[PDB]
Design a binder for this molecule. Structure first.
Ligand SMILES: Nc1nc2c(ncn2[C@@H]2O[C@H](COP(=O)(O)OP(=O)(O)O)[C@@H](O)[C@H]2O)c(=O)[nH]1
Ligand code: ALF
Ligand SMILES: [Mg+2]
Lengths: 120, 310
């Protein structure tokens, strides 16, 4: 499963190295930015952190801008108006699917992993 | 004699499908095991297509022909293959309100393979179902990043780099611009009446044109073979009598028929060339999902990549 990969320290780092090879690491980063963000109980830190995550990965002039459609983008922008813990669930699902469907299967057929399973 | 080749183009123009057609042509087809791996995608492609139409009905305010479909729609959303879901999906698809919405897909975002999968639900929904080569070809997965794949045709070895077409992916394209032998630039002809999935204010064809102006005339590619695939011709053919090209080109004085409108698109792109004396856009009308056609076009391309590089 893909859910196992995303749960382990080793797995994530290995998967990152691969995504770097295909210039799509921004996906995994955001997804990890979202799993930290939602643990925040304070409504101020959420407030600020939401502007940070949105500024880096979502925004149309974003440095690590992730590939999501117009609807999911502008929804996440209206979810900022009051940043709760779920603010990015939509954007985070689009991104998870992007990794699961497209680049996760290539990773399983990569030598990066092929060797580390051969070790396993 | 290793050649470096690029598939560039806006999102959903058909780059990844051309990459699949290499695996089929210049390797030896898909296995049966390899096909059984595309089940999930076909099923998910199908489920996503139909959700897309139904969500558009509440936005566009279109009624079901038969009010009991609301109850299936509910189940659809919650369930997302099994018999229950198939039945739900089938019943939704046959509904006249659903079909009125499907015939207005230009106002929202719908996978092009929708009709193909949905019209074939009986086969797909079977328990012992194994995708066909075409089913596999019809599958949609968003490419994110830059995928390098190596190929050996009859007279050429190819390093072939496939990229994502969406705006957020275009930053990354600069990683493979060095020593580029040829660029196949995909354009989805059927996009003339559609908007971008990443900007609803932006017509997809005007987007491809701006993109093409910038690649065609880019300094990096003075020495690269610019090849222009006018793709999804099959989808365009069955569109054009239903939806007029004036959506995309208000200037257009010609008939909304397949050949003339296709000749017109072609000229628009080809007019973007800023050094026509010295540079030649090699144009081909393609159906990416039609192996035979992509086989014939790739022979014509290869010849240009010999003539212009030896
Ligand atoms: N009927 C038809 N479908 C196509 C054609 N080209 C691409 N498709 C389908 O349209 C979708 C987009 O193709 P894809 O290669 O994934 O787009 P990409 O983002 O440019 O790589 C896929 O589901 C393909 O099966 C074509 O020429 N004809
Ligand atoms: F340009 Al794409 F998936 F939309 F390769
Ligand atoms: Mg692709």
């Amino acid at each position: 499963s893909f859910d196992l990969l995303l749960s382990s320290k080793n797995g994530v780092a290995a998967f990152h190295a691969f995504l770097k090879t295909e210039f799509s690491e921004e996906n995994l980063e955001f997804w990890l930015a979202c799993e930290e963000f939602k643990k925040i109980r304070s409504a101020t830190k959420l407030a600020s952190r939401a502007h940070q995550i949105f500024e880096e990965f979502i925004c149309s002039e974003a440095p690590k801008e992730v590939n999501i459609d117009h609807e999911t983008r502008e929804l996440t922008r209206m979810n900022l108006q009051t940043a709760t813990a779920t603010c990015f669930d939509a954007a985070q699902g689009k991104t998870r699917t992007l990794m699961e469907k497209d680049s996760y299967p290539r990773f399983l057929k990569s030598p990066a992993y092929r060797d580390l399973a051969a070790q396993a | 004699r290793e050649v470096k080749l690029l598939l560039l183009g806006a999102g959903e123009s058909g780059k990844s499908t051309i990459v699949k057609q290499m695996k089929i042509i210049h390797e030896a087809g898909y296995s049966e095991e390899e096909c059984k791996q595309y089940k999930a995608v076909v099923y998910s492609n199908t489920i996503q297509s139909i959700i897309a139409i139904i969500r558009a009905m509440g936005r566009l305010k279109i009624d079901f022909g038969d009010s009991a479909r609301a109850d299936d729609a509910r189940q659809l959303f919650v369930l997302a293959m099994t018999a229950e879901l198939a039945g739900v999906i089938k019943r939704l698809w046959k509904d006249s309100g659903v079909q009125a919405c499907f015939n207005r897909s230009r106002e929202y975002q719908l996978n092009d393979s929708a009709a193909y999968y949905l019209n074939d639900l009986d086969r797909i929904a079977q328990p012992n179902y194994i995708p066909t080569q075409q089913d596999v070809l019809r599958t949609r997965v968003k490419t994110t990043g830059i995928v390098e794949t190596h190929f050996t045709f009859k007279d050429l070895h190819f390093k072939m780099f496939d990229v994502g077409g969406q705006r957020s992916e275009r930053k990354k394209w600069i990683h493979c611009f060095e020593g580029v032998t040829a660029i196949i630039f995909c354009v989805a002809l059927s996009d003339y009446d559609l908007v971008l999935a990443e900007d609803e204010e932006m017509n997809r064809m005007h987007e491809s044109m701006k993109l093409f102006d910038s690649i065609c005339n880019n300094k990096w590619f003075t020495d690269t073979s610019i090849i222009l695939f006018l793709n999804k011709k099959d989808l365009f053919e069955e569109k054009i009598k239903k939806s007029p090209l004036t959506i995309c080109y208000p200037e257009y004085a010609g008939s909304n028929t397949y050949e003339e409108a296709a000749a017109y698109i072609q000229c628009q792109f080809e007019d973007l060339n800023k050094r026509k004396d010295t540079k030649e856009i090699y144009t081909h009308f393609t159906c990416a999902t039609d192996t035979k056609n992509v086989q014939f076009v790739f022979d014509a391309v290869t010849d240009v990549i010999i003539k212009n590089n030896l």
